[PDB]
Symmetry: D2
Subunit: 116 residues, 4 copies
């Protein structure tokens, strides 16, 4: 699994379950092309977005749909979503974990990048 996303909830002290995630890759014409999407499991984790073959060099945007997550829980949050934009695989294939920690008026993100 070359790209994985994990999301925690800072209000409940739990995984953030059923969070929609959309990944885009910047195209030659500088627009964002849809690349992969899915939703986090009971453990807050989203596996299986892509494959080593398809996950080529590029600029990627991981959009985490925080608003829909909070509204589904009955909360009115500040942000529309949380974005993480980065160049990937520029020095050969790596494995990326994108982690986010959510609050209604705040979020944090970090990346773990490892070499297989």
């Amino acid at each position: 699994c070359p790209l994985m996303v994990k999301v925690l909830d800072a209000v409940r002290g739990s995984p953030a379950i059923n969070v929609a995630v959309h990944v885009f890759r910047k195209a030659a014409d500088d627009t964002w092309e849809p690349f992969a999407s899915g939703k986090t499991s009971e453990s807050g984790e989203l596996h299986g977005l892509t494959t080593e073959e398809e996950f080529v060099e590029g600029i990627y945007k991981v959009e985490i749909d925080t608003k829909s997550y909070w509204k589904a829980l009955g909360i009115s949050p500040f942000h529309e979503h949380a974005e993480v934009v980065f160049t990937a695989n520029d020095s050969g294939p790596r494995r990326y974990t994108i982690a986010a920690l959510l609050s209604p008026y705040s979020y944090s993100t970090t990346a773990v990048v490892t070499n297989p």
Copy 2:
């Protein structure tokens, strides 16, 4: 001031100085139109972005050019830039402070929304 941006550096323990910040407003056709921009001051702050009359309800995106910031300090960064995407809502308090805390592989953002 209806909209203020403040950026801090978690590696140096300082304001993030001379960081470029672009604000966009979402247009009816869902494209992002330029709205305001500037560079953070010696205190990491960017004031004067807009006025009450110009800052109407809507979806806004604040793009912080973190990559240039780190490169100017000789640090290899992960992100292309940081985004903060939010709805401005007249019901709520009048003044928005968007704060961001920068690290090379991570970032945190929060909103401080208050009445004078």
Copy 3:
């Protein structure tokens, strides 16, 4: 002002108002001795804690009574309190800002250390 504390609320998107803050200095016998304390203002800030003459090099601990803060808002919190433990060093810049961002199961803190 050589030492300032600022506290924000990630659930409400506001300053954290009326939060008790205790500062301790580490004594030669490794116990923590009271040094200064106060309550955050309506802007989430606590000024006037100490003076240049009193704030000598050493190890300090800033305790923020997060549990009382959340309970006063009717929110069930995880932590007993938040701590920030650091060395004051005269080599470095003169002014220390300790900032904390509070959620019920999480918190973030950073230091902004600058010269006037």
Copy 4:
């Protein structure tokens, strides 16, 4: 595993490896008694601190030795350590994950609490 600790590094985009962790439990006399300690693995994780039997009701302090971690990498950090202080197992046994994200002048912590 009723108590686990995970630590990431925001500068390197990696697990924080070989981080010393000390856990204390508040005693009847209000002093902090040593409870368990260990260090994070190659994956940034610390398992095996305690057992369901020994991990009784109490106020616990998880001290993460961030200074020793950064100094071992040649960096002079701001904080002495990162503390997480909380009441545990007050409503029966739970499983706690304590996560931290480290930068030289900043850290973040969150907790995941689950019911077995």
